């Protein structure tokens, strides 16, 4: 699945891994994350992520 980078800190949201410690099971697409989900490292909102693809 896709990877998304936080433009603030460099954390990678990997859809294959999810974010289970913050309530997100593996295989959750970025677009399916709750509107209130934030970067687990720096707290950046979803707006600050960019998908890693051309």
Author numbering: 0 to 53
Task: Tell me what the authors wrote about this structure, in their words.
In the current study, perdeuterated Pyrococcus furiosus rubredoxin was produced with the iron atom from the [Fe-4S] cluster replaced by the 113Cd isotope. Here we show that it is possible to use neutron anomalous scattering to phase protein crystal structures in a practical fashion. The present demonstration takes advantage of the neutron anomalous scattering properties of 113Cd, the availability of modern high-intensity monochromatic neutron beamlines such as D19 at the ILL, and protein perdeuteration to determine the structure of a biological macromolecule using de novo phasing in a reasonable timescale.
In the current study the anomalous scatterer was introduced in the metal chelating site using chemical reagents to remove the native iron prior to isomorphous replacement with the 113Cd isotope. As pointed out by Bacon19, isotopic replacement of hydrogen by deuterium atoms in a crystal provides a crucial advantage in all but eliminating hydrogen incoherent scattering and thus enhancing the visibility of the anomalous signal. It should be noted that this method may provide a useful complement to X-ray anomalous phasing approaches – particularly where structure determination at room or physiological temperature is advantageous. Anomalous protein phasing work using X-rays can be delicate when carried out at room temperature, and neutron approaches, for which radiation damage effects are essentially negligible, provide a way of tackling these problems. Experiments close to physiological temperatures can highlight structural differences induced by cryo-cooling, and which may be more representative of in vivo structures and their resulting functionalities.
